[PDB]
Coordinates of N, CA, C and O in Angstrom, one line a residue:
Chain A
X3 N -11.1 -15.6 -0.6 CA -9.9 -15.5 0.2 C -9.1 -14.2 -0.2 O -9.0 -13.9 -1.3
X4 N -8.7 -13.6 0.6 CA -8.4 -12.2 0.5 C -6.9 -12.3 -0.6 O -6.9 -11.6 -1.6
X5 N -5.5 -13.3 -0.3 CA -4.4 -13.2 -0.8 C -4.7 -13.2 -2.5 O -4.2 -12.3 -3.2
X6 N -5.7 -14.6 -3.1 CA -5.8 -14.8 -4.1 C -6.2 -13.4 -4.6 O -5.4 -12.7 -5.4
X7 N -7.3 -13.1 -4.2 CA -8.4 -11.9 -4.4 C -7.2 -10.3 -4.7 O -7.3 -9.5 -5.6
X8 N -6.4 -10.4 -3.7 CA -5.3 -8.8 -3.7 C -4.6 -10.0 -5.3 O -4.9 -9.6 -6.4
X9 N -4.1 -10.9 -5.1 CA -2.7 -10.8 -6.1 C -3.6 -11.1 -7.7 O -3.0 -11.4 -8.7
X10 N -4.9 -11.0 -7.6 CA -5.9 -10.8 -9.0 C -5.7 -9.2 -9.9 O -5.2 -8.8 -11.0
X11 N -6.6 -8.8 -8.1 CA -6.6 -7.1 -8.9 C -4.8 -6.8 -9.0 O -4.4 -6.5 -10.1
X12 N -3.9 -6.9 -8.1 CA -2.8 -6.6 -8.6 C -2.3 -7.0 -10.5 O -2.0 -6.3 -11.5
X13 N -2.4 -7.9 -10.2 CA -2.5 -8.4 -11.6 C -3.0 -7.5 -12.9 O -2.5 -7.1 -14.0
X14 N -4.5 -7.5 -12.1 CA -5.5 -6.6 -13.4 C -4.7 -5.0 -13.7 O -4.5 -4.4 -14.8
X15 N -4.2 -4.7 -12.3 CA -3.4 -3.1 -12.3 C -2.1 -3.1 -12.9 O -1.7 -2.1 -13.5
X16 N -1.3 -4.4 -12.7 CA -0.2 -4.4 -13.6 C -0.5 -4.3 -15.4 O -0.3 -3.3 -16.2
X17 N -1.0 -5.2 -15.5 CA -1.6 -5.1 -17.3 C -1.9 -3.9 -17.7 O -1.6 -3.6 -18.9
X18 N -2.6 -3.0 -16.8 CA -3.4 -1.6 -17.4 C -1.8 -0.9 -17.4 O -1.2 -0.4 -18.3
X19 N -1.5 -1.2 -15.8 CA 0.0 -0.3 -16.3 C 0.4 -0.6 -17.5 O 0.4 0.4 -18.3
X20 N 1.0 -2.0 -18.0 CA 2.1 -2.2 -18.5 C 1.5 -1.8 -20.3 O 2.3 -1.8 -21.3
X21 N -0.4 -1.5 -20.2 CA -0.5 -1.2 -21.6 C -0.5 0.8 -21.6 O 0.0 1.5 -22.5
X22 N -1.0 1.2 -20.7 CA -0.8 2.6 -20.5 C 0.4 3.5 -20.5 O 0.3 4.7 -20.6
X23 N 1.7 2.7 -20.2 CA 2.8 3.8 -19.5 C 3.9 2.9 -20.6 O 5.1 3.2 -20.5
X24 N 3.5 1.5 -21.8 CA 4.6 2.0 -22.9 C 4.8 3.0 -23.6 O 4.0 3.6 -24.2
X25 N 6.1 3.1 -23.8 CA 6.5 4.0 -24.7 C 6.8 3.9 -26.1 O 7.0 4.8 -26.9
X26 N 6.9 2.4 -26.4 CA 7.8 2.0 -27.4 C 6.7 1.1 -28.0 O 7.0 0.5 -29.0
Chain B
X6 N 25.1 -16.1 -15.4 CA 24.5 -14.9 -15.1 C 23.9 -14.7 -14.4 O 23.7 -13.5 -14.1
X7 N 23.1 -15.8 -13.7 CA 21.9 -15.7 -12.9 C 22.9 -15.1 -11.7 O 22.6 -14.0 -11.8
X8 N 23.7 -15.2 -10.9 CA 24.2 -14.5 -9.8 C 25.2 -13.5 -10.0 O 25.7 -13.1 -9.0
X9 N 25.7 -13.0 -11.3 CA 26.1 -12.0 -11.7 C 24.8 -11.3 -11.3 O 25.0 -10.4 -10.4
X10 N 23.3 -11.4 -11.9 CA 22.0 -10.7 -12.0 C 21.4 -11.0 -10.5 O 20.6 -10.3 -10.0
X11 N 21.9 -12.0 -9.9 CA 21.4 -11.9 -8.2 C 21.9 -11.2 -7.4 O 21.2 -10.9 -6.5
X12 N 23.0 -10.7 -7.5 CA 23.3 -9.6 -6.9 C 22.9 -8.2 -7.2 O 22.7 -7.4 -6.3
X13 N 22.6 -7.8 -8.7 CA 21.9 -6.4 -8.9 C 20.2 -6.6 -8.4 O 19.6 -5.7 -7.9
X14 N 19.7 -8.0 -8.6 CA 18.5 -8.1 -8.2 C 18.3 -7.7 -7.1 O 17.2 -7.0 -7.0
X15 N 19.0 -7.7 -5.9 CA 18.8 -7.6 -4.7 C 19.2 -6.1 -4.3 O 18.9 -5.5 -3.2
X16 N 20.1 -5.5 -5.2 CA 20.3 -3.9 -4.8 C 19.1 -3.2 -5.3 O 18.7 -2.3 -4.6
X17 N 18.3 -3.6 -6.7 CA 16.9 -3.3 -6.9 C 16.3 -3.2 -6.1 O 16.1 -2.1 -5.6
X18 N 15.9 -4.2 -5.5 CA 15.0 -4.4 -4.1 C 15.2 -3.2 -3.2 O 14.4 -2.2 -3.0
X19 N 16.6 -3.5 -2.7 CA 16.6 -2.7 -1.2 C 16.6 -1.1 -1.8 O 16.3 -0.2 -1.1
X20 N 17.0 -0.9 -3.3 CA 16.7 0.4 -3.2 C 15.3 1.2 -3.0 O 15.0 2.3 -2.5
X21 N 14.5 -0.3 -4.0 CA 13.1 0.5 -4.3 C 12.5 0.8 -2.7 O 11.8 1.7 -2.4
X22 N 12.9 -0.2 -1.8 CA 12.2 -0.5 -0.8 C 12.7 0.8 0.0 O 11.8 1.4 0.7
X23 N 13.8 1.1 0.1 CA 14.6 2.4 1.2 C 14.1 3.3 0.1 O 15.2 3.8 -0.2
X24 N 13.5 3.8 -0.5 CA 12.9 4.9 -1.7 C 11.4 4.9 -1.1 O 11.0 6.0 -0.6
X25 N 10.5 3.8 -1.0 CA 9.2 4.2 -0.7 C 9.4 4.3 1.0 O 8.7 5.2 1.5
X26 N 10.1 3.7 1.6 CA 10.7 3.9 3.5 C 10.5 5.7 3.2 O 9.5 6.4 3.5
X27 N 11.8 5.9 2.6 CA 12.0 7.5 3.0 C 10.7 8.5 2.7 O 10.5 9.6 3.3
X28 N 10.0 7.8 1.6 CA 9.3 9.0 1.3 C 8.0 9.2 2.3 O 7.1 10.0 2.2
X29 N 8.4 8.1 3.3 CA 7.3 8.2 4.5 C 8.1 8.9 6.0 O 7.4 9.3 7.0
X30 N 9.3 8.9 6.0 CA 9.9 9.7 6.7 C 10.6 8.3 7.7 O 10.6 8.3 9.0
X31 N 11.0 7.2 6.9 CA 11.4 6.0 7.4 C 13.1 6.0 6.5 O 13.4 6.8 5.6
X32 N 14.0 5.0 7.1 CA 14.8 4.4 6.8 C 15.0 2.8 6.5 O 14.5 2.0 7.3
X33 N 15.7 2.4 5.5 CA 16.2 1.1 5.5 C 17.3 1.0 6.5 O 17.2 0.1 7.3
X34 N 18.1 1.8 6.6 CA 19.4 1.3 7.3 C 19.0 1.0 9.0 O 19.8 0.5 9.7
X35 N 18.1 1.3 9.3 CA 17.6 1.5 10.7 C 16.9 0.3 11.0 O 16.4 0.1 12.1
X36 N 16.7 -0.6 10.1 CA 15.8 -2.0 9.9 C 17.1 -3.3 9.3 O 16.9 -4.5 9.6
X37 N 18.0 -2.9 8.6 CA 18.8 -3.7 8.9 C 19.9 -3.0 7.7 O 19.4 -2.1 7.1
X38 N 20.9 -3.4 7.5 CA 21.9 -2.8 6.5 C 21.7 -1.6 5.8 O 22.6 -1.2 5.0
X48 N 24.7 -5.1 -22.0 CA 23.6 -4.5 -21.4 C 24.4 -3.0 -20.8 O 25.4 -2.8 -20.3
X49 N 23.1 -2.1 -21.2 CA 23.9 -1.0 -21.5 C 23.6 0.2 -20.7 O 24.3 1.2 -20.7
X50 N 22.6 0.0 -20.0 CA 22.0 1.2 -19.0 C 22.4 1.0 -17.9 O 22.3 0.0 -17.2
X51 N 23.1 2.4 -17.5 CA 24.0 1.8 -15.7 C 22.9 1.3 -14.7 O 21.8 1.6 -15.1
X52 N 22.8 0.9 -13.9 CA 22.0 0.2 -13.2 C 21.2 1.2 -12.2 O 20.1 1.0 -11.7
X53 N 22.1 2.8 -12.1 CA 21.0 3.9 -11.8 C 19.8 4.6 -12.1 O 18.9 5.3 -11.5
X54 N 20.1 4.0 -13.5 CA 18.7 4.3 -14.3 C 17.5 3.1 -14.3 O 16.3 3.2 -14.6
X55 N 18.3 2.1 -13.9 CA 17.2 1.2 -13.9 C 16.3 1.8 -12.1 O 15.2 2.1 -11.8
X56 N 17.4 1.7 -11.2 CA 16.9 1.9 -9.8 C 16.0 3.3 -10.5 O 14.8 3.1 -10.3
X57 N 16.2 4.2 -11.0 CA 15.1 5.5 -11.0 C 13.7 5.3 -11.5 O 12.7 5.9 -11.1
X58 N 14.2 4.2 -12.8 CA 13.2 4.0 -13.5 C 12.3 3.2 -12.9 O 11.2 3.4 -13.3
X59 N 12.5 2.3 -11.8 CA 11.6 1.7 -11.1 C 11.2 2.3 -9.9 O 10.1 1.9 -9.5
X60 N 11.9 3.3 -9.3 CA 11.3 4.1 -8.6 C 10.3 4.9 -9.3 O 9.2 4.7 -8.7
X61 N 10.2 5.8 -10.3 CA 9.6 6.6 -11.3 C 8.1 5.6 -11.3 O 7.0 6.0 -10.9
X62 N 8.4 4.3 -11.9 CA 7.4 3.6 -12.0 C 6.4 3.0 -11.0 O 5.2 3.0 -11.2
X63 N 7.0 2.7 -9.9 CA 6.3 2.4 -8.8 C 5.7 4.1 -8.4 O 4.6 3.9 -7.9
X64 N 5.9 4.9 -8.4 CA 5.4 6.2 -8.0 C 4.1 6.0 -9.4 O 3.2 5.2 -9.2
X65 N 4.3 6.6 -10.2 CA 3.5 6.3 -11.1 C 2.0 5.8 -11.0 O 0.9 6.4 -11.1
X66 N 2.4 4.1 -10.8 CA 1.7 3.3 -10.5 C 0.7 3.0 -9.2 O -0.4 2.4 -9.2
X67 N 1.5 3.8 -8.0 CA 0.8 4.2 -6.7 C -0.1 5.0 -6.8 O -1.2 4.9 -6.3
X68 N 0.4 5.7 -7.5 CA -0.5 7.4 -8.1 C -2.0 6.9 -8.9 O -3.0 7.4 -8.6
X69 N -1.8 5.8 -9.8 CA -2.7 5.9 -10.7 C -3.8 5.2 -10.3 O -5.0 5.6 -10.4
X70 N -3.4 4.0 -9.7 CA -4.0 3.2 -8.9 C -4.1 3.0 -7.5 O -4.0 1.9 -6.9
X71 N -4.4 4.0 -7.0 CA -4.1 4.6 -5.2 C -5.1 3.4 -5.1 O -4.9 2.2 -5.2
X72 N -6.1 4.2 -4.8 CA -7.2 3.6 -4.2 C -7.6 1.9 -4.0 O -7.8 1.1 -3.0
X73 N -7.7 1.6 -5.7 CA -7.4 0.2 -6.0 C -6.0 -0.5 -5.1 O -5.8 -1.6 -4.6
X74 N -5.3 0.6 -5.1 CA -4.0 -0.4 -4.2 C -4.0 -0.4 -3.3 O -3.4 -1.3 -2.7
X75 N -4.7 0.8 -2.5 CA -4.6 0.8 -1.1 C -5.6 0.0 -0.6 O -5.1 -0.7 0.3
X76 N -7.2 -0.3 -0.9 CA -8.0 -1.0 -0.7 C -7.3 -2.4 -0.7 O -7.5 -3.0 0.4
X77 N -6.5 -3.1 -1.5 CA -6.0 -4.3 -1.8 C -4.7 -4.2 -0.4 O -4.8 -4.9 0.6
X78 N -4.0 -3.6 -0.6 CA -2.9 -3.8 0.7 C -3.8 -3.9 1.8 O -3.4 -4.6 2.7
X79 N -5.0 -3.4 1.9 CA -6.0 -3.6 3.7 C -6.2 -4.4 3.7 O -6.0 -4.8 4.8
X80 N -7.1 -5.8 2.6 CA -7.2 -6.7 2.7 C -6.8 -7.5 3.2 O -7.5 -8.3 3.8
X81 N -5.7 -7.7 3.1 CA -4.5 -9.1 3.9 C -4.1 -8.7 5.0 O -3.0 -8.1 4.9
X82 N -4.7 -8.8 6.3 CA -4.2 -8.7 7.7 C -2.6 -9.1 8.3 O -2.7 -10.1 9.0
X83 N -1.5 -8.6 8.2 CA -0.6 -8.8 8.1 C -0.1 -9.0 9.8 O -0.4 -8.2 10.7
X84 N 0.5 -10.1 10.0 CA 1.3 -10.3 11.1 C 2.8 -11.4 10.7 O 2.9 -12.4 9.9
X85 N 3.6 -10.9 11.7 CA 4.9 -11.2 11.6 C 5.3 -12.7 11.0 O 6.1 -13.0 10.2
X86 N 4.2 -13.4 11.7 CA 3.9 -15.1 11.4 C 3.4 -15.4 10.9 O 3.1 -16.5 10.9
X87 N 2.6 -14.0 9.6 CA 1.8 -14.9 8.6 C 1.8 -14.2 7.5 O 0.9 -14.1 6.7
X88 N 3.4 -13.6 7.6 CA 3.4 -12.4 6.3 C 3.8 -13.3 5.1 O 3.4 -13.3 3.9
X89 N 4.9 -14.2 5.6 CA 5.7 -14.6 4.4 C 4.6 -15.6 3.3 O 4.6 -15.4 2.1
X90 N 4.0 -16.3 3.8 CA 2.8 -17.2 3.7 C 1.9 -16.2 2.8 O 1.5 -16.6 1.7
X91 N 1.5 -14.9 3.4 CA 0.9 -14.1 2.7 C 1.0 -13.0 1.5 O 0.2 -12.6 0.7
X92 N 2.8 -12.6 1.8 CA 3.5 -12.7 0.3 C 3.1 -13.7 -0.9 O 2.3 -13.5 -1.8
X93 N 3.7 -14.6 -0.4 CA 4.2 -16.2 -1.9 C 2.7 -16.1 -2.2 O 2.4 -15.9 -3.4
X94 N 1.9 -16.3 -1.4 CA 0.1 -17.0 -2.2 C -0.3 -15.4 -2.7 O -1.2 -15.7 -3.5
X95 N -0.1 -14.1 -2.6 CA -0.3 -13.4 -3.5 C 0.8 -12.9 -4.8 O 0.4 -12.1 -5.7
X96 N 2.0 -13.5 -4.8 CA 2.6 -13.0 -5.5 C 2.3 -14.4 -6.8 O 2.1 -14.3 -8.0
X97 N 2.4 -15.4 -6.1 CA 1.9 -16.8 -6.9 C 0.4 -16.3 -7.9 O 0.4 -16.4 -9.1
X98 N -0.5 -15.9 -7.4 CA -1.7 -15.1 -8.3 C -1.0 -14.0 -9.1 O -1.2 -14.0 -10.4
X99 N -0.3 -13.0 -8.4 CA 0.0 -12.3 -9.3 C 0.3 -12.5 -10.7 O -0.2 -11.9 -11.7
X100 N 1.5 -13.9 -10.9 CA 2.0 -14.1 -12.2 C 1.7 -15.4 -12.2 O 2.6 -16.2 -12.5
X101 N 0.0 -15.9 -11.9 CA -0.2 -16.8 -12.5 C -0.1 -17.3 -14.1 O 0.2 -18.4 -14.6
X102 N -0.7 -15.6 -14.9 CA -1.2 -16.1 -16.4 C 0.1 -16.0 -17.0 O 0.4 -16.3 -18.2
X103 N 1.2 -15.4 -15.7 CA 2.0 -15.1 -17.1 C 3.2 -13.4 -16.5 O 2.9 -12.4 -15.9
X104 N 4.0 -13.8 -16.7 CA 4.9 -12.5 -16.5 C 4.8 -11.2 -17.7 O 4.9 -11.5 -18.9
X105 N 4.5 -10.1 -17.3 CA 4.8 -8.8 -18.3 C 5.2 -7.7 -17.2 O 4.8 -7.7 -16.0
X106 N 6.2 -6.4 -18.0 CA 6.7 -5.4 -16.9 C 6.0 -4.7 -16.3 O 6.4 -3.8 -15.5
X107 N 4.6 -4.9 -16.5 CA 3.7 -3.6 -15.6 C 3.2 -4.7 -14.0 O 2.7 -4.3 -12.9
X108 N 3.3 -6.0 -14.3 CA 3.1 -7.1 -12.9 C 4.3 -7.1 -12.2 O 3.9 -7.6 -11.1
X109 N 5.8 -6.8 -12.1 CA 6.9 -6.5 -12.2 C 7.0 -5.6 -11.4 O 7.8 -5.5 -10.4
X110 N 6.2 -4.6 -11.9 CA 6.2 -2.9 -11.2 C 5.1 -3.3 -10.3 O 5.4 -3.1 -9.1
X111 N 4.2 -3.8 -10.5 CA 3.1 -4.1 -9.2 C 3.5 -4.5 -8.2 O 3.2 -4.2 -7.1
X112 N 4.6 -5.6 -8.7 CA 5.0 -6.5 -7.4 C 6.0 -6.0 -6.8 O 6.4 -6.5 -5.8
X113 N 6.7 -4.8 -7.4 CA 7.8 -3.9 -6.5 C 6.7 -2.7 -5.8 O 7.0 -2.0 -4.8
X114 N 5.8 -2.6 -6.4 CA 5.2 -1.8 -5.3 C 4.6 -2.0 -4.1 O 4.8 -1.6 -3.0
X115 N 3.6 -3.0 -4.7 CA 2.9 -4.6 -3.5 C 3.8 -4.3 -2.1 O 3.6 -3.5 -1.2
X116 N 5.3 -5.3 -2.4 CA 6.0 -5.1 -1.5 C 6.5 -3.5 -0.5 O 6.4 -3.2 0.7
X117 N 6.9 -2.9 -1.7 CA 7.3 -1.7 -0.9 C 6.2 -1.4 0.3 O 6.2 -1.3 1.5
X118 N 5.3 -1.2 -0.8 CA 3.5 -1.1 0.3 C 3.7 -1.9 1.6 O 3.3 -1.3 2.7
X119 N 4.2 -3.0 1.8 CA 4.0 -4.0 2.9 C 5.3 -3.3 3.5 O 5.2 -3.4 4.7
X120 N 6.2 -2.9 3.3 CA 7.3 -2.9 4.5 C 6.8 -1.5 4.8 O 7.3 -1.2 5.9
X121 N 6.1 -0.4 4.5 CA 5.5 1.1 4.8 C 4.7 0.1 6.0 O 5.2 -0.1 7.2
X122 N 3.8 -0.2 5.6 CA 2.9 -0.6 6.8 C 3.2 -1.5 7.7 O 2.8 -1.3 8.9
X123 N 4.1 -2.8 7.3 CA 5.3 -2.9 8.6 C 5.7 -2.2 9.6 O 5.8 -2.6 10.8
X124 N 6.2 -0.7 8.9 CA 7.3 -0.5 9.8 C 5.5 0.4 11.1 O 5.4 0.3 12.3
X125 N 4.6 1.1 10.0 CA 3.7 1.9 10.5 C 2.8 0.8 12.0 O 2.7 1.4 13.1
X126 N 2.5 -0.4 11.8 CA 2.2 -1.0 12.7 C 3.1 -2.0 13.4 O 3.0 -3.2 13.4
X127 N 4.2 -0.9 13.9 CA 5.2 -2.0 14.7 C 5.6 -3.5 14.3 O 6.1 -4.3 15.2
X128 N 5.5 -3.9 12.9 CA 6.5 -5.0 12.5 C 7.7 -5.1 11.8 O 8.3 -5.7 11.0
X129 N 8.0 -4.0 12.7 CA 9.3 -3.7 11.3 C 10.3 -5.1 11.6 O 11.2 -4.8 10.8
X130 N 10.6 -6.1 12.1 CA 11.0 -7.2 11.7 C 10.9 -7.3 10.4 O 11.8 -7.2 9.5
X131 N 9.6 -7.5 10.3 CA 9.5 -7.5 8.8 C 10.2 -6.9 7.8 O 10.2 -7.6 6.8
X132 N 10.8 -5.8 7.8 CA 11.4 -5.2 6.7 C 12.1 -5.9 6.1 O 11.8 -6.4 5.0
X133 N 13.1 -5.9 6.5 CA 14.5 -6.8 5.6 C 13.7 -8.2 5.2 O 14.0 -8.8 4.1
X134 N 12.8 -8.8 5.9 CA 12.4 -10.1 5.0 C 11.6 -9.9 3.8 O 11.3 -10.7 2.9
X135 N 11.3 -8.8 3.8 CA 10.2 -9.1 2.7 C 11.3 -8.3 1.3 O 11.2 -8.4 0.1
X136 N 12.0 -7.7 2.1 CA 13.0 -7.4 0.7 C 13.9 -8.8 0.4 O 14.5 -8.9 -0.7
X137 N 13.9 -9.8 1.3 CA 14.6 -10.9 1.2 C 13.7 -12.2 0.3 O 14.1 -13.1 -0.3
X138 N 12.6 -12.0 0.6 CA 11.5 -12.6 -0.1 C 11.1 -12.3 -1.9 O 11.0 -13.0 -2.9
X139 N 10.8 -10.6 -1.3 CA 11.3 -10.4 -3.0 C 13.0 -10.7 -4.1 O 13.3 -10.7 -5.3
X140 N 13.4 -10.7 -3.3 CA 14.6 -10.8 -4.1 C 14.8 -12.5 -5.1 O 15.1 -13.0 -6.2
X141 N 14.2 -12.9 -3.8 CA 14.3 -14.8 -4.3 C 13.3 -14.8 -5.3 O 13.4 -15.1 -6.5
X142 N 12.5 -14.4 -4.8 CA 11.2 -14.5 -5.7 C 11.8 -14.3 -7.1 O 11.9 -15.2 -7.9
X143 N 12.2 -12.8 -7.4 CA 12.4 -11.9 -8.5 C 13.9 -13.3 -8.9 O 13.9 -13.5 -10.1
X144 N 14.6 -13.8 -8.3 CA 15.7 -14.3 -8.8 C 15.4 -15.8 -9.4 O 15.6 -16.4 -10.5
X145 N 14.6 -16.2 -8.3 CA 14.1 -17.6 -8.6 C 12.8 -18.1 -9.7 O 12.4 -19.2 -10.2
X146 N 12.6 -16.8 -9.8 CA 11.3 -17.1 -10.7 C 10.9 -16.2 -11.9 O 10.2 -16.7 -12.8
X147 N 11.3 -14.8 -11.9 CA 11.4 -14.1 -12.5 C 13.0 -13.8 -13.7 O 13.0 -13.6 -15.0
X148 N 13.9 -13.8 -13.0 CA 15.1 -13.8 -14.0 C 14.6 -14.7 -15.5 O 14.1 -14.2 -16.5
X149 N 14.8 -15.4 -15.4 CA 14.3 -16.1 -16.8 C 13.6 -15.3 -17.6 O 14.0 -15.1 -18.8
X150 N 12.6 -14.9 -17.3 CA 11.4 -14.0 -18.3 C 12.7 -12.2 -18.4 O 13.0 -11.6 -19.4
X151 N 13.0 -12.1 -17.2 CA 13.7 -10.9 -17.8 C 14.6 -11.2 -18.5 O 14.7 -10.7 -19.6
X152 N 15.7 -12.3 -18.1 CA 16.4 -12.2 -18.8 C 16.2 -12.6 -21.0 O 16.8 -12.4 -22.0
X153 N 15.2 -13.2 -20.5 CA 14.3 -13.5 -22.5 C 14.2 -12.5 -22.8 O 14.6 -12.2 -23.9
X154 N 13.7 -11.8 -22.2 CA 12.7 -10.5 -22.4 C 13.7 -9.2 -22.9 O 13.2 -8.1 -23.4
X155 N 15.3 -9.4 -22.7 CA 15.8 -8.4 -22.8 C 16.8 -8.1 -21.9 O 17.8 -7.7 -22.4
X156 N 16.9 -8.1 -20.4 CA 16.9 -7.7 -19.2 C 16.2 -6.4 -19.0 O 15.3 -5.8 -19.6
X157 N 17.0 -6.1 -17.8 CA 16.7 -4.6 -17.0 C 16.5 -3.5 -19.0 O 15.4 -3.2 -19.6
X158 N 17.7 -3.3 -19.4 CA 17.1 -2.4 -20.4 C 16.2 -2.6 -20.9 O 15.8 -1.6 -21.5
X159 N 15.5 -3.5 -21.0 CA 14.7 -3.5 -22.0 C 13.2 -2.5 -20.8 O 12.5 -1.5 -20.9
X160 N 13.4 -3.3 -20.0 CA 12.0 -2.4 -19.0 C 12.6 -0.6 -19.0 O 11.6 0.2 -19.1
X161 N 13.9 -0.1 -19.0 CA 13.7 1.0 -19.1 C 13.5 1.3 -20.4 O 12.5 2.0 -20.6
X162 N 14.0 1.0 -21.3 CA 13.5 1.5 -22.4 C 11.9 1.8 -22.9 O 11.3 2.7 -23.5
X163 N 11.4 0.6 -22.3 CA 9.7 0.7 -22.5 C 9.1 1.3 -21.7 O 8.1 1.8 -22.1
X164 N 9.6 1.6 -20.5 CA 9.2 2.5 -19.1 C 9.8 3.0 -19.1 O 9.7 3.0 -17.8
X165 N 10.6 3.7 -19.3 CA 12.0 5.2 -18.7 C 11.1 6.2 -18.9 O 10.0 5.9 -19.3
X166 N 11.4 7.1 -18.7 CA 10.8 8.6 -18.4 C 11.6 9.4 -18.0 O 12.1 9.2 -16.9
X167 N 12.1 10.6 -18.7 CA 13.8 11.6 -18.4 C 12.7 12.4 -17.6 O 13.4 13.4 -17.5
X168 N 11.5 12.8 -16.9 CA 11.4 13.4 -15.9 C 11.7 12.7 -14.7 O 11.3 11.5 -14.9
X169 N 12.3 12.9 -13.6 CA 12.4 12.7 -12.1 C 11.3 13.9 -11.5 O 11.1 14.0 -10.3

């Protein structure tokens, strides 16, 4: 199903963000 | 606090959202209406949502095509992906996803004649972010604490 499937990889893209772009 | 913080929640919103509008050559107004001043938070989340668009285009753009969006089956199609989004768990880079997610959806709103849509889905995120998210920010620190871990003094 496409919603589950987008709000996954969003997911997976948030984490990479949220380990790549701290600063602190 | 929670509606002291519902009110900034929702100026977050419409800012980020009239920030990714313009930089397509759109308007918000044309669709309908702790220690860091709250401008630096709006930059800092704009900064980051750019960022994050940038790093992960492709991955994001591919994912915004997937969900066939119409007027009567957006909101439905917000909540069941924003509900996966922070299934395992809230942290600030799902936060920034989900302010981009959206922004993404009211671009392509307005690009395929739904701009109805605009003001709801900033009205959707706002609840969302108030009703379900405040708590983890507000644990977490608030707003400062996301700039401090994400700020960036380039614009």
């Amino acid at each position: 199903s496409p919603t589950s499937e987008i709000g996954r990889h969003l997911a997976q893209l948030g984490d990479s963000y949220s380990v790549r772009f701290q600063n602190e | 606090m929670s509606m002291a913080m519902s009110q900034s929640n929702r100026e977050l919103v419409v800012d980020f959202l009239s920030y990714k509008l313009s930089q397509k050559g759109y308007s918000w107004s044309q669709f309908s209406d702790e220690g860091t001043e709250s401008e630096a938070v709006k930059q800092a989340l704009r900064e980051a949502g750019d960022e994050f668009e940038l790093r992960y285009r492709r991955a994001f753009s591919d994912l915004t095509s997937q969900l066939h969006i119409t007027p009567g089956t957006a909101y439905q199609s917000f909540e069941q992906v924003v509900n996966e989004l922070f299934r395992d768990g809230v942290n600030w880079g799902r936060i920034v996803a989900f302010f981009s997610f959206g922004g993404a959806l009211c671009v392509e709103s307005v690009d395929k004649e739904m701009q109805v849509l605009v003001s709801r889905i900033a009205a959707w995120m706002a609840t969302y972010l108030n009703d379900h998210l405040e708590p983890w920010i507000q644990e977490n620190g608030g707003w400062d604490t996301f700039v401090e871990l994400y700020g960036n003094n380039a614009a």
